[PDB]
C-alpha cells in the first residue's frame, strides 16, 4: 500500500478548490540538514510538501496557481539534471520527466526561482505561504513580493493578501483517505512485528540499545528504512523518563523495560509503546501498576468512536487511574475529591491521545483540552501511562516503575479499528510470549 500520483493530484485539486480565484499557493521542500562537517542526515521531506507531491528532493517548490474558478495549473521548481552532480550525489528527477512523473503541468529549474517566481505572482490578489516555516523559503517569497511592490514602472503588482495555508492543509491531513489508512495499517503491522521481536529477544544483561537494534532491523526488513521518531528503550528507572533515548544501560533482571518505537512507512508513522519485564515475569508490584494502565487502554479502545472526544475518554481514564492508585495506597482519600484535585498528575502527566499520520503528534486542531468531536477518518494514539519516581512518597515496592502501553487507532463509522493489536499487551500473553522465546 502506498500513495499514488493520482492521489497527490486530488490533494492539490482539493487545496485549489479552497483557494480564492486570482491566487497562488507556495509549498517549499525541507532543507538538507548537516549531521557533522560535510555529512548530512538522511533526508526527510517536509510533511506538507510530501503530502502534495510524494517527491523526496530538497531545493523544490510546488506552485499552485488558481487563475479563476475554472482555470488552474501547477508549476514545480526542482533541481536541474546535471551529469556531474548526479555521478557524485545521486539521480535527480529534473524538468523533462517531472510533469509526467509527478502529474504537474510545468517544471522549471530551482536555480531560476528568483527570476521566475515574481512573474507567477504578478497580478494575483492572494498568495498562500507558510510564513516562518523555513528561512530560505521566506527569503525567496519576500524577495519576489518586494520586486513586485517596487515594480510599478514595469507594470508589476504584488498580491496584498498573504494567507497561511497550514490551517487548511492540516485540516485536510487530519482526515485520512482509505489509501492513507491502508498505509497506516501496514506501518502499524510493521511496528507491531518490531515490538514482538523486542519482547522475544530481550534478556537480562542486554543493553537497552540492543532492543533498539532489533526494532530498527525489523523496520528495515519490511521496507520502513527509518523510524518515525527516536526510539525509546527505558528500563528500570529510565522508564520514568518520558522521552528517554540514551538507551545506554544494561537491562537488569527484575526491572521493567518500556519501549516506545515506530516506523515510517511510505511517509506514514507507526507509534507503539509496550512495557514488559526484562526477565519475562512481572513482579506483583509491577503487575499491580500494569493492570491499571491496561484497564485504562482497554476501556479507551472500547469507548473511542465518532461523537466522543479525547477529553471525554480521558475523564474515564483518570477515574480508572485514581481508583486503582487509591486501592494500592499510592493515593489516599476520596476518589471524587482526588479526581477533582487532579491527584493523578504526578503519575500520569501527559495526554492520552495524539493525532497520527505523516508525523507522530500529527497536525490538526484538537479543540480546547482536546475536546474536538471525533469523526471517521481521524487517526490517533491511545497512550495511558503511570510513572512512579524512585523517590516518590508511596509504598516502596512501586518506586521506579514506569509503564506506558500505546496503540494506534482509526475512527470508523461504528467505533474504531486498532492498527497495532497484533503485538500482545495482556500481561499473561506477554509472559507466555517471553516464556516461549526464553526456551529457545
Amino acid at each position: 500500500s502506498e500513495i499514488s500520483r493520482q492521489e497527490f493530484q486530488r490533494r492539490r485539486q482539493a487545496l485549489v478548490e479552497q483557494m480564492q480565484p486570482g491566487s497562488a499557493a507556495l509549498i517549499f521542500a525541507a532543507p538538507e540538514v548537516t549531521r557533522s562537517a560535510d555529512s548530512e542526515y538522511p533526508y526527510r521531506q517536509n510533511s506538507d510538501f510530501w503530502y502534495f507531491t510524494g517527491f523526496n528532493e530538497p531545493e523544490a517548490v510546488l506552485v499552485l496557481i488558481k487563475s479563476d474558478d475554472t482555470h488552474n495549473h501547477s508549476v514545480l521548481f526542482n533541481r536541474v539534471r546535471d551529469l556531474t552532480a548526479e555521478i557524485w550525489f545521486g539521480r535527480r528527477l529534473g524538468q523533462d520527466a517531472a510533469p509526467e512523473k509527478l502529474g504537474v503541468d510545468r517544471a522549471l529549474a530551482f536555480s531560476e526561482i528568483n527570476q521566475q517566481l515574481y512573474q507567477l505572482l504578478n497580478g494575483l490578489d492572494v498568495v498562500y505561504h507558510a510564513q516562518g516555516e523555513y528561512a530560505y523559503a521566506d527569503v525567496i517569497v519576500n524577495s519576489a513580493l518586494e520586486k513586485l511592490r517596487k515594480g510599478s514602472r514595469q507594470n508589476l503588482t504584488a498580491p496584498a493578501t498573504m494567507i497561511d495555508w497550514r490551517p487548511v492543509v492540516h485540516e485536510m491531513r487530519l482526515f485520512k483517505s482509505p489509501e492513507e489508512i491502508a498505509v497506516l495499517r501496514r506501518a502499524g503491522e510493521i511496528t507491531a512485528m518490531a515490538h514482538t521481536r523486542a519482547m522475544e529477544k530481550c534478556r537480562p544483561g542486554m543493553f537497552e540499545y540492543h532492543l533498539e537494534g532489533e526494532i530498527h532491523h525489523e523496520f528495515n526488513r519490511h521496507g520502513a528504512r527509518y523510524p518515525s521518531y527516536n526510539t525509546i528503550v527505558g528500563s528500570g528507572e529510565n522508564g520514568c523518563i518520558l522521552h528517554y533515548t540514551e538507551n545506554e544501560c544494561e537491562m537488569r533482571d527484575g526491572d521493567l523495560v518500556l519501549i516506545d518505537a515506530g516506523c515510517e512507512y511510505k511517509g506514514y508513522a507507526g507509534d507503539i509503546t509496550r512495557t514488559f519485564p526484562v526477565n519475562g515475569k512481572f513482579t506483583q508490584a509491577q503487575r499491580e501498576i500494569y493492570d491499571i494502565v491496561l484497564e485504562s487502554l482497554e476501556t479507551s479502545l472500547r469507548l473511542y468512536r465518532p461523537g466522543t472526544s479525547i477529553l471525554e475518554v480521558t475523564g474515564e481514564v483518570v477515574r480508572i487511574m485514581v481508583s486503582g492508585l487509591v486501592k494500592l495506597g499510592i493515593l489516599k482519600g476520596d476518589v471524587d475529591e482526588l479526581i477533582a484535585q487532579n491527584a493523578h498528575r504526578p503519575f500520569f502527566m501527559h495526554g492520552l491521545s495524539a493525532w497520527l499520520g505523516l508525523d507522530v503528534h500529527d497536525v490538526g486542531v484538537y479543540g480546547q483540552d482536546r475536546s474536538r468531536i471525533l469523526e471517521p477518518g481521524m487517526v490517533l494514539t491511545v497512550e495511558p501511562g503511570l510513572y512512579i519516581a524512585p523517590d516518590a512518597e508511596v509504598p516502596e515496592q512501586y518506586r521506579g516503575i514506569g509503564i506506558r502501553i500505546e496503540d494506534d487507532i482509526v475512527i470508523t463509522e461504528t467505533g474504531n479499528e486498532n492498527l497495532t493489536a497484533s503485538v500482545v499487551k495482556k500481561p499473561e500473553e506477554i509472559e507466555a510470549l517471553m516464556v516461549a522465546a526464553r526456551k529457545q
Copy 2:
C-alpha cells in the same frame, strides 16, 4: 577502548599551551536539529566540542581562560538541572556534577551565558572563536564583545584580536594518540564485521536497503549505535553513483554491489567500501575491472609510510589504472601519454585518500594536491575505484560496472597498520566466503 576524562583534560591543556597569555578560547556545542515538526534527529555533538569534552549535550559552551603563562582555568556553560524538563526529555548533567565528571574548574547555567560571558572576556587581549561555525554561537560572541566595546564607562574592554582556533585544533586532531588509535581500531573491526555480514547475507532479489539493515544491526550490537555517514548500497548501475544512498533497488543476479559503510564508535569513524557479486561469482568482465582496483589498493597499502604522500602514492595508482585500462581496450594509446593526459579521470574521478577520525573526511591540512608528507599518527582511507558508466564508449561488457575497495590505515613508525583487513577483498576470498554462506 574509549577516551577518558584525563585525555580530554590533556587536550584542553595542549590547546592552552598554544594560546597567547591574556586570552580565552570559546568552543560551542552543536545545536539540536529538526527532522520533522516536533521530532529531532538523534543528537550529534560538534566534533571539536566533543574532542575537548566527551560531553553529549546541546546548549553548552567550553571556555578556556589563559590568564598568563602559568595560570589558566576552564568554565563550562551547560543546561541546568530541571526536574520537569528531565522527566520529559532526559537527564542533564547540570552544574554541581560537571566539574568532577568532565574535569573542568567551574560550571555555570547556559541560561546565564549572556550575563556572564562578557565578564570572562573583559580585559583579555585575544579571543579564540570559530567564527561562522554556528549562527547561535556568533550571536552570543558578538553580543558579549559589543557589551565590552560599549562598556568603557563601566571600565570594560574588549579583546581586539579574534583568532580562529580551527587550524590549530584541526592540526591536533590530525595526529592521533595511542588511545584514539585503539578506538579507531575497534571502529574498524566493527565496521569490518558488518561488511562481512553483508557479503554473507546478500542474495539476488534482496533490496539494497536490506544490506543496509544487516550492517546497521551489526554496528548496533557492538555498541556503535549510529553510522558515521549515510550507508551506500549501490548495485549494478547504482554502483557508478559515488554517494548513492537511495538503496531502493532490487539487487540483480549478475550485478555487482558496492557497499560503502562505516560505524561511529565512541565518536570515531570507520569507513569501509567493498564491492562484490550479488550472486557470489564475479563475471570475467567484473573480475578484470576488480583486479585493477585491488592491485591499486594493495600497492597503496605496501607504499603508505612516513615520508611519502597521498599525491606520490596516487601517481602509482594512476599508472596501475591506466596500464590496466589500456590492456582491456577501455583506454587506447601510450600509457605515459595517457597518464600525462589524466586519461583515467572519466573512470577514477575522486581522491585516493581522505583523513579519518571523529569525522570521515576528517579535518587537517592536506597540502597542495594532497602533497603533505605523512607522519606517524595520521589516519587515512585508501579508496581506489573504477566506474564505467552504462553509456561509456568502451567494450560493451564493462558498461555499468562500479567498483571501489577501501581500507582505513594508520601511519606508523615503520609503515602503516591496516585497521580493516579483517573483511576480505581478494576476489577468490570473496567468492569462497559467499559460496560458504550460500550453502546455508
Copy 3:
C-alpha cells in the same frame, strides 16, 4: 493651517471602515537613524504612521482593533515617562497623557509590546501589516504570530490572513482633505518665498551652497524647519545633473542656475524648481531653451483638470518640446516621426508629474504610463525640463544648458489650483526681479 487630533481620528476610522471584522491593523513608527557615531539625524516620522497620529516619537506602534462591524478601538504603544531619559534626551508623551492628546483609547509601554501584542491579535482572523517596511517591526509581528501559532495549549490562535495596508492607505493619502490642501498651500507659499529669495540674492561668485543657505533660512523663519528633500543648486553644467546636491561650485557669470527645493511644513511637502541666469540676464541661447520649457509648463497648467491624465498632458508637452527643438536645429526631421521615435528623450528623460503630499514623489497608484484619470483632491507636481549635455551633438551654443521649471498643483472640480505661482517664472519677470535686487 495644520492637521488636528479630530482629523487623525477620522483617518483611523476611515481605515477601520475598510477593515474586515475580527481584525487588527499595525502601524509602526520610523526608527531613529545614526548620522555618525553617537549622533542621530533629526528625526523624521514614518509618513503613514504620521498620517494616522501626528505623533513624532520613535518606538511607537498604533494598533487599530476592529472586533466586529460596530465595535472597534485603538491602542498605542509608546515610550514610557522616565525622568532620567527625559532630562537627557527630551520629553516623552508617556501613557497617561496619550489617550487625550492623540485621541486613542488606550496607551501601553513600548517596552511591553512583546508581552502584549500577541494578546491583542489572539483570536483575530486578519492582521494588517506592512511587511518589509521595517526590520524591527517585522521582528515584533513575526514573534507575536509565532507565539499564537505555537500556543494552542494556552488556547491561543493566530490570524491566518495578513494584508498589506499600504495599497489602501496610499489610496487614502492620494486624495487630500481641504485641511491637507490648506497645509500644502502654505508649504507652497513658504517654498515660493524661498525661491524668490534665492533669485534676489544670487550673484556671480557666490557658491551654489550659498543659495541653499538662503532657502533653508527662509523655510525656517516660517516654521518649516526641514526641507522635504535635499536641495539641488545646479549651476552651468551641474544643471544637467537631475539630483545634483553637491552644491559645491562657484556660480559663473553667464551660466544658468537650476534650484530644486521644497520645505516640509507640518508634515507636507513643497517642491519647486526655478532656473534663472546667475547674472540676471538670459542669453539668447538660454532664452530659446527656457521658452520651450515654460510653454510646456504653461500649457500643462491650462490643461490639468479632472478627467485628463498625466499621460495625456505629457503627450502635449512632448509635441511642444519636439517642435521647439526642431525649430532650433537641436532635433532634425519630421515632428510627428520624431515624436513617434521619442526623439525628445535625450533632452527630457524624466516624468512630467509626480504625486505630492507627506512625501515628494508621494504615494498612490499612477496607472500604466501614468494614465490614471485625474480627480479632485489629487496633488501633483508639473516639472518639464530640457537638459543639453556639454558634449551633445547639437549647435554649440546650447551645450551645458539644464533648465527645469516646476510648480505644485491641486486638481479641483473645475481645473487646478497652482500652489506655487507666487514665485515668478516668465523670463521677463525673472529678469525684472533680479534687476531690481541687483540695484540694491
Copy 4:
C-alpha cells in the same frame, strides 16, 4: 584650511606601520540612509573611512595590504562611472581617476568586491576589520573569509587572525596634526560667529527654532553646510533638558536660552554652548547661577595643560560648584562633606569634557573616570553646567534655570589654546553685546 591628499596618504602609511607583515586592513564607507520613502538624508561619510581618504561616496572600501615590512599597497573599491546613474544622481569618481585623485595604488569597481576581495586576502595571516561597524561590511568580509576557508582545493587559505583596527585608529585620531588643528580652529571661529549672531538676533517672542535658523545660515555662509550635531535651543525650563532639540517654543521675556550648536567644517566639528538672557539682561537669580558655571569654565581653562587630566580638573570644578551652591542656599552643609557625597550631581549630572575631532564626543580612550594624562595635540570640550529643575527643592527663584557654557580647546606644549573664545561669555560682555544689538 583643509586636509590634503598627502596627509590622507601619511595616515594610511602610519596605520600600515602598525600592521603585522602579511596583513590587510579593510575600511568601509557609510551606507546611505533613508529619511522617508525614496528620499535620503544628506550623506555623511564614516569618520574612520573619511580619516583615511577624504572620499565622500558610499559603496566604497579601502584595502591596505602589507605584504611584508617593506612592501605595501592600497586598493580602493568604489562605484564605477555610469553615464545614466550620473545624469540622475551625480558624478562619481570612478576607477580611472581615483588613484591620482586619492593617492591609492589601484581602484576596482565596488560591484566586483565579492569576486576580488577574497583574492586580496588569500594567503594573508591577519585581517584588520571593524567587526560590527556595519552589517553590509560584515557580510562582505564574512563571505570572503568563508570562500577562503572552504577553498583549500583551489589552494586558498584564510587569515586566521582578525584584529579590530578601531583602538589603533582611534588612538591616531586622538592626537591632531597641525593641519587638523588649523581646520578645528576654523570650525571654532565659524561656530563662534554663529553663536554671536544668535545673541545679536534673539528677541522675546521669537521661537527657539529661529535661532537655529540664524546659526545654520551662518555655518553655511562660511562653507560649513551641515551642523556636527542637532542644534539645541533650550529656553526657560527647556534649558534643563540636556539634548533638547524640539526648539519649538516661543522664547519668553525673563527666561534664559541655552544654545548648544556646532558646525562641521571640512569634516571637523565645532561644539559651543552659550546661555544668555532672552531679553538681554540677566536677573539676579540667573546671574548667581551663571557666575558659578563661568568660574568653573574659567578655572578649567587656566588649568588644562599637559600632565593633568579631565578627572583632576573636574575635582576643581566640583568644589567651585558645591561652594557656590552652598553660598546660595541651594545645597546645605559642610562643603567637604557635600563634595564627598557628590551632592552637586542633581544639578551637574554630566562630564566636564569630551574629545573633539571628526566627531563630537570624539573617539579615543579616556582612562577610568577620564583620568588619562593629557598631552599636546588632544582636543576637548570644556562644558560645565548647572540645571535647576522647575520642581527642585531649592529657593524658588532658582527653579527652571538651565545654564551651560562650553568652549573647545587644544592641549599645547605650554597649556591650552581656546578655539572658541571669540564669542563672549562674561555676563557683562553678553549684556553689552545684546544691548548694542537691541538698539538696532
